[PDB]
Design a protein around this ligand. Structure first.
Ligand SMILES: [Ca+2]
Length: 572
C-alpha cells in the first residue's frame, strides 16, 4: 500500500476557505449548506464535501477566479482528524492520495484498530459507499496535501453533514477586513461578479495582498514612485532631449539603441546609486533585444491607452535577459537594483517604441513600460531561495520554452470505477538560455461531453505564493471539443519558477466503449492533447487549431507560440 491514515491532534483547530463574492455574502449570515453549493464541492460523489485550507494563504491562492475573500472556520475539538500520509518516508506525495479506492483501503485499515465501524467497501461495490459521506457518519475529517506541486500545504476535507453542524459564530467573515476583497458596489447584483475591469483590478489588489499576508517577497509596488520620478528626471535632462522630443515610428536599429543604452545606464546609476559593491544587472544585448520586442508589440497591437500599452509590455518575451533580476537579486541592495533595472527597462523601451498619439509623448510610453515591467516582476519571488522543480518526462521545447508532464499523463477511466482524474504538466524555461522569460497567456485541453468533463473548480495554475487567476471557457466546435484557461494577470515563466498546470476531469461509463473496429477510437476524446501558449497568436490559429489532430505543428509552422503535449486515455 502506498498511502496510510493516522489520527493527529492539531494545536489549532482553525481552517480557512476561499470563496466567491456570492459565497462570502452568504456565509456572513448563514451556515454551510450542501444544498447551497452547486457542485457540492466536487463533481465526484466520492469526494463531495466542504474543502478548506490549512492556513489563510493556501486558501487565498486556491481561488482561481472571481475572488470574494477568505473566511476563518473553527471546527469542534471532538472531530477526529485523519491525515493521509505516504508509506515511503522519502515521498511526501502520492497520486493514491487522490483516488477514492486507495484512500478507502487506508481509512478502513485505520478504522479496524481504532474502534470505528466502516462499510466493507470493495472495488466492486465502491459506487454504493461515497467516501466523504461515509466518514461524515463517523465524526471524521481528512487532512491531505494540496497536490504534488504543493506538498507542504494541506486541505481539510469536511463531510457536508458535519460542515453543516458548525455554529455561525464559528464562521469568521469580519475580524480581518483585509480577508474581504470586494465591496458590494464592485459587483452586479444580477451576476454578483465584478461590474467592470476597474472593479476587477481593485479586487485583485486586495486578493494579492491577502495572499502574501511578507510571504511573496519584495514588494515591487513599493518603488513605483521612485521609478516614475527617476524616468521623468531622465527625460528633463537636456542631454536626452532627443528622446524627449522624439516622434514618428519605432527605432529597432541595434547600433542606435546601443548608443542610448550607454547614455542611459550611467545616467540611471547617477539618479539612484546602487550600494557599495553592487552592480547593475541590465545587459546591453538583452535590453536592446527586449526593447525591439516592445516596439514590435506596440505596432502590432495598436495600443490605444496607457494601460493597454502597459499590458502589452508585460507579455513581451525576454524581459529576464534585459533586467537580469528575474531569478535572483543581490541581497545587499535589492531596493536600489529594483529601482535601477525597471527604470533602465522602461527607458530603453521609451527609445524604441513608436510614439503613438493615444499614449502621449515618448515619456508616457516609458512610464507605461515601467508599470508593465513592474507588474511582471511583482509576481516573481525574486530574492527568495529557488525551489527544486518537479521531475518531468516527455518534454517539448519551442522558442526557449519547455512543456512536460509531471508523473503519468494517462487518464484512466476505471480505477476501479469512474471518478475524478487528473494530470499535471509544467511550463519551463530551457536552461540553454538561463535568464530567458516568456508569458503564460493561456492553456487549453480537449474534452468530451459526458465522457471526459473538465472540472473548472479543480483546475489549478501554480508557481509560488501568489494566486494565478484564469478564466475557464468551454469552447464551441466539435473538432475538437475543447476548453481553455485564460490567465487574468501577467504570468511569467522563469528558470527558477516554472508554472504547474493541473487539469482535472470526470470520467464515466461512457468514456471508453467496447466493440469499435479501431482500437484507438475506443476512448473519447480521440487524439487527446493539451496545449500551452506563451506568445502572440498566429493568424487563423487558436487553441482549437493546435488541439486538432490536423495541426501542422512547430516544424511546418515555426512562427507558432504554442506547445502541444499529447496524452492517452484508457478504459482501465
Ligand atoms: Ca512581489
Amino acid at each position: 500500500e502506498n498511502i496510510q491514515v493516522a489520527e493527529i491532534t492539531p494545536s489549532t483547530r482553525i481552517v480557512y476557505r476561499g470563496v466567491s463574492p456570492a459565497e462570502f455574502i452568504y456565509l456572513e449570515g448563514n451556515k454551510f449548506s450542501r444544498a447551497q453549493s452547486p457542485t457540492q464541492g466536487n463533481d465526484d460523489p466520492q469526494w463531495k464535501a466542504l474543502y478548506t485550507g490549512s492556513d489563510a494563504n493556501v486558501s487565498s491562492r486556491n481561488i482561481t477566479d472571481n475572488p470574494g475573500g477568505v473566511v476563518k472556520i473553527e471546527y469542534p475539538s471532538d472531530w477526529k482528524v485523519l491525515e493521509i500520509t505516504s508509506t515511503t518516508p522519502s515521498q511526501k506525495w502520492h497520486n493514491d492520495m487522490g483516488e477514492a479506492w486507495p484512500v478507502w483501503r487506508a481509512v478502513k485499515k485505520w478504522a479496524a484498530s481504532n474502534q470505528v465501524d466502516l462499510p466493507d467497501v470493495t472495488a466492486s461495490n465502491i459506487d454504493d459507499y461515497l467516501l466523504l459521506d461515509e466518514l461524515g457518519k463517523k465524526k471524521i475529517i481528512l487532512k491531505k496535501p494540496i497536490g504534488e506541486d504543493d506538498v507542504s500545504s494541506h486541505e481539510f476535507i469536511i463531510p457536508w453533514k458535519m460542515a453543516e453542524t458548525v455554529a455561525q459564530n464559528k464562521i469568521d467573515s469580519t475580524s480581518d477586513p483585509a480577508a474581504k476583497f470586494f465591496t458590494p458596489d464592485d459587483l452586479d447584483s444580477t451576476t454578483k461578479q465584478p461590474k467592470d475591469q476597474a472593479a476587477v483590478r481593485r479586487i485583485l489588489k486586495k486578493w494579492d495582498a491577502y495572499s502574501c499576508k511578507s510571504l511573496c517577497g519584495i514588494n515591487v509596488a513599493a518603488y513605483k514612485a521612485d521609478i516614475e520620478k527617476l524616468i521623468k528626471d531622465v527625460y528633463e535632462d537636456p542631454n536626452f532631449s532627443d528622446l524627449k522630443n522624439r516622434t514618428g515610428g519605432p527605432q529597432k536599429d541595434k547600433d542606435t539603441l546601443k548608443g542610448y543604452y550607454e547614455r542611459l545606464k550611467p545616467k540611471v546609476e547617477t539618479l539612484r546609486p546602487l550600494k557599495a559593491g553592487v552592480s547593475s544587472a541590465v545587459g546591453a544585448a538583452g535590453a536592446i533585444s527586449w526593447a525591439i520586442g516592445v516596439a514590435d508589440a506596440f505596432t502590432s497591437e495598436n495600443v490605444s491607452s496607457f494601460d493597454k500599452a502597459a499590458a502589452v509590455t508585460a507579455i513581451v518575451p525576454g524581459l529576464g535577459e534585459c533586467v537580469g533580476i528575474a531569478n535572483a537579486i543581490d541581497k545587499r541592495d535589492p531596493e536600489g537594483l529594483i529601482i535601477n533595472t525597471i527604470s533602465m527597462a522602461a527607458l530603453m523601451a521609451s527609445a524604441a517604441v513608436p510614439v503613438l498619439a493615444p499614449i502621449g509623448v515618448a515619456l508616457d510610453a516609458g512610464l507605461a513600460a515601467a508599470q508593465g515591467v513592474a507588474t511582471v516582476l511583482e509576481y516573481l519571488e525574486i530574492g527568495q531561495p529557488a525551489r527544486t522543480p518537479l521531475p518531468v518526462s516527455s518534454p517539448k521545447t519551442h522558442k526557449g520554452v519547455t512543456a512536460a508532464w509531471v508523473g503519468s499523463e494517462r487518464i484512466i477511466a476505471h480505477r476501479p470505477r469512474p471518478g475524478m482524474r487528473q494530470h499535471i504538466f509544467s511550463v519551463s524555461i530551457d536552461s540553454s538560455k538561463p535568464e530567458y522569460t516568456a508569458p503564460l497567456i493561456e492553456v487549453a485541453g480537449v474534452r468530451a461531453d459526458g465522457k471526459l468533463d473538465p472540472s473548472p473548480e479543480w483546475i489549478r495554475i501554480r508557481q509560488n505564493h501568489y494566486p494565478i487567476p484564469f478564466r475557464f471557457e468551454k469552447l464551441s466546435g466539435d473538432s475538437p471539443y475543447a476548453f481553455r484557461c485564460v490567465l487574468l494577470r501577467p504570468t511569467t515563466i522563469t528558470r527558477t519558477e516554472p508554472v504547474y498546470v493541473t487539469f482535472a476531469y470526470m470520467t464515466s461509463d461512457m468514456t471508453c466503449r467496447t466493440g469499435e473496429s479501431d482500437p484507438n477510437k475506443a476512448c473519447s476524446p480521440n487524439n487527446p492533447a493539451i496545449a500551452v501558449r506563451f506568445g502572440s497568436l498566429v493568424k487563423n490559429e487558436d487553441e482549437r487549431s493546435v488541439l486538432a489532430v490536423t495541426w501542422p505543428g512547430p516544424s511546418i509552422r515555426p512562427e507558432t507560440n504554442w506547445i502541444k503535449l499529447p496524452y492517452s486515455i484508457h478504459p482501465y
